[PDB]
């Protein structure tokens, strides 16, 4: 594969507005009170924190910052080999050409997350007003659940499920009826959430269990190739691979439950009640009723993975620009990012 | 005064303050409406959207869900009965649409 | 560097119309997987004859 470019043109499509209503429009928009304003759709300060191979926890530390006009954390897990370095043109170590979840939003590792802790000043839990059944920390899913804190037929926590439903549609206090299709998009949580379960034979209750490995398993003999897509070989004989769960010699078995979310980023609003109430949250304006700079330290817990992985945390902010043209062929702008630095910043 | 000190910055840059249709000059506002059917100018501007900061919610010393153990159990042959003594705290309200 | 706009433009276009309607001009044609591949709903085969 090689690709080269010969000729790149730029096309501009001009509305043929009338001459003397176009000059009215121009005059209006040379004013510094009529200056256009835009914002990034996902207003974000984006940070990637390595997860070593088989690491179970990744702490985050952040120095003291004025957190005025802050909005919820959002997070997802990526792979080191599948994410190219950003800020530097050309990454020589990127030897992957499949879907880049960083830039395409094709997330799929959101089901490995297991807890998230939020702390300000390294001594006060943000879920510290005892808003959750497990008082400090959100838990994303339960491993070792005997206290029945899981939603239907998956590992997901009741507390977590409530937070997510509130985040993406504002529902939890009126029940958990399905969202409308208008407000349940292609990347919305609800659509992509799939519970699942199977029952599979143990060894701590089943007493005729033999652990037969793949080589010595046989089933469908004389009709299929041996450990290869080759031609058929062997003889018709009784199978011996899977164990019944029908009714005739149905063996004792243990439930495995899990969920998958793909194309979803996890999200915790920065709001006193996690339901959304317009863009500027009530805790962004409570850092003007709490003027100060606080440290933000967090902790995450994930499944081990042999592959090296990254933790991608979108700190939601306001990226907002105001574009003025005072005079002909003059354009300028003042740009502001609120709790994360508004300029100079990262190269 | 005694107002938030980030208020002048926000007002300017449309994170807080007034809708762009009170911020814009009145002549531009009527221009946009007239030519709304073939030349939108609405997406060129921002409307501030801002949460109430008081009287809405106070999460102080309250869980957002409770679990209630049975206080009656009948483990009959075809039916099961369970009672719960609910406690709805003072200055709280319960919606029964979220009881399950 | 700590701005990301390539990602943010995919989120913009999920909030404006469907992403499953393909457009060959700007090359919109969202990535998908078939949910019968990832999740395997093995329900046997209808051999009966």
């Amino acid at each position: 594969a090689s690709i080269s470019f010969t000729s790149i043109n730029l096309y501009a499509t001009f509305f043929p507005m009338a001459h003397n209503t176009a000059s009215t429009l121009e005059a209006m928009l040379r004013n510094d009170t009529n200056d256009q304003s835009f914002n990034d759709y996902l207003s974000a300060a984006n940070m990637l924190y390595p997860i070593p191979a088989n690491a179970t926890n990744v702490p985050i530390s952040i120095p003291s910052r004025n957190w005025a006009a802050f909005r919820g954390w959002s997070f997802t897990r990526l792979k080191t080999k599948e994410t190219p370095s950003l800020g530097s043109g050309f990454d020589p170590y990127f030897v992957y050409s499949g879907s880049i979840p960083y830039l395409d939003g094709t997330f799929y590792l959101n089901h490995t997350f297991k807890k998230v802790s939020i702390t300000f000043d390294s001594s006060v839990s943000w879920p510290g007003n005892d808003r959750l059944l497990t008082p400090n920390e959100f838990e994303i899913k339960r491993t070792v659940d005997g206290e029945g804190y899981n939603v239907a037929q998956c590992n997901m926590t009741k507390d977590w499920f409530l937070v997510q439903m509130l985040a993406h549609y504002n529902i939890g206090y009126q029940g958990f009826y399905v969202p409308e299709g208008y407000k349940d998009r292609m990347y919305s949580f609800f659509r992509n959430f799939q519970p699942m379960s199977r029952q599979v034979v143990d060894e701590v209750n089943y007493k005729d269990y033999q652990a037969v490995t793949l080589a010595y398993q046989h089933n469908n003999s004389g009709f299929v190739g041996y450990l290869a897509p080759t031609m058929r070989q062997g003889q018709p004989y009784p199978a011996n691979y899977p164990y019944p769960l029908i009714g005739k010699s149905a063996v004792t078995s243990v439930t495995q439950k899990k969920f998958l979310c793909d194309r979803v980023m996890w999200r915790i609003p920065f709001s006193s009640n996690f339901m959304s109430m317009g863009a500027l949250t009530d805790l962004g304006q409570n850092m003007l009723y709490a003027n100060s700079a606080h440290a933000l330290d967090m902790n995450f817990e994930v499944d081990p993975m042999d592959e090296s992985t990254l933790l991608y945390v979108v700190f939601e902010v306001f990226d907002v620009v105001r574009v003025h043209q005072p005079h002909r062929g003059v354009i300028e702008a003042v740009y502001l990012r609120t709790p994360f630095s508004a300029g100079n910043a990262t190269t | 005064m005694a107002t938030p000190s980030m208020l002048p910055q926000w007002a300017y840059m449309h994170i807080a303050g007034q809708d762009a249709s009170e911020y814009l000059s009145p002549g531009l506002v009527q221009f946009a409406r007239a030519t709304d059917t073939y030349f939108s100018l609405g997406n060129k501007f921002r409307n501030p959207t801002v949460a109430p900061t008081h009287d809405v919610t106070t999460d102080r010393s309250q869980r957002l869900t409770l679990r209630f153990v049975p206080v009656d159990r009948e483990d009959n042959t075809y039916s099961y009965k369970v009672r719960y003594t609910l406690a709805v705290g003072d200055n709280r309200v319960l919606d029964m649409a979220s009881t399950y | 560097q700590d701005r990301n706009t390539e990602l943010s433009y995919q989120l913009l276009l999920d909030s404006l119309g469907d992403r499953t309607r393909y457009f060959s001009m700007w090359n919109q044609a969202v990535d998908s997987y078939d949910p019968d591949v990832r999740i395997i709903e093995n329900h046997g085969v209808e051999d009966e004859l």
Partner: peptide, 11 residues
Amino acid sequence: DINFSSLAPRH
């Protein structure tokens, strides 16, 4: 996901 409310004046 879903970010920001209606950012267009009601005409």
